[PDB]
Amino acid sequence: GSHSMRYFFTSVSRPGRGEPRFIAVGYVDDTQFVRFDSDAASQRMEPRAPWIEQEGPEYWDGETRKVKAHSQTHRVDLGTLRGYYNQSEAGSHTVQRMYGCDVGSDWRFLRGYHQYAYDGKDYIALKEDLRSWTAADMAAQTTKHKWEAAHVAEQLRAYLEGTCVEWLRRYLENGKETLQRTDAPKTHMTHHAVSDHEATLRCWALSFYPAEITLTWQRDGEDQTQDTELVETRPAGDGTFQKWAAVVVPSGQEQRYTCHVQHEGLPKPLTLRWE
């Protein structure tokens, strides 16, 4: 299947004292593999998956240098954007950045992206052509002009189509045992009486990877959304994910209802029925 490498960065300003809190996370697909936290003791990029620990000192020194460089850019930007928006020095504000690259089943480049946000709203983003920028307002338009003059998109494109993909492939091979394994959802149904005439059926998907999944209910072979509840997909804490979907049904009619589970690790979708 397809794969991605993505880095996420958050900086939060601290007007009362000191420098911004800065947290960086790197992922391959849905697996976190590195982190940096300005509040942590190491002041280094740190490993979070066994298959990255084999990288040598030059890797860790370089990733620490670069992630600190990201943090300083964010710090500068928090000041600059406070000025663009004519905001007080007394408030805390946030910059968020996400970039990365996707490859297809053949491990060839599919797409790249670089998104930047201020106070939780779109600020500037690289378009899918990897040449142009989308600026949400006139402050971001000022940034866009700066980044055009500095030819940022050209350097970013070269990374996204080259280095990003090449290192993603390296990680996919080094971490093959887990990164190239799909964990199909372990599925079951539970039944809960909610009155003399109503019952709830809850369809469970547990311990699955990657996180993408679809759970749907049908009644007598037709999709039903009325009287259903679908929770957000949530982390188990061991690298896998969980989800459930529930439906309220007249007691005694449980057999009409089927839960349908689609996931990359299933050759065919699963159908569950309370029988």
């Binding site: 954007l81 500037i124 940022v152 350097q155 990003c164």
Partner: peptide, 10 residues
């Protein structure tokens, strides 16, 4: 691997 090219300021 992180991007290295200059993290252009806004």
């Amino acid at each position: 691997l992180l991007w290295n090219g200059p993290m252009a300021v806004s």
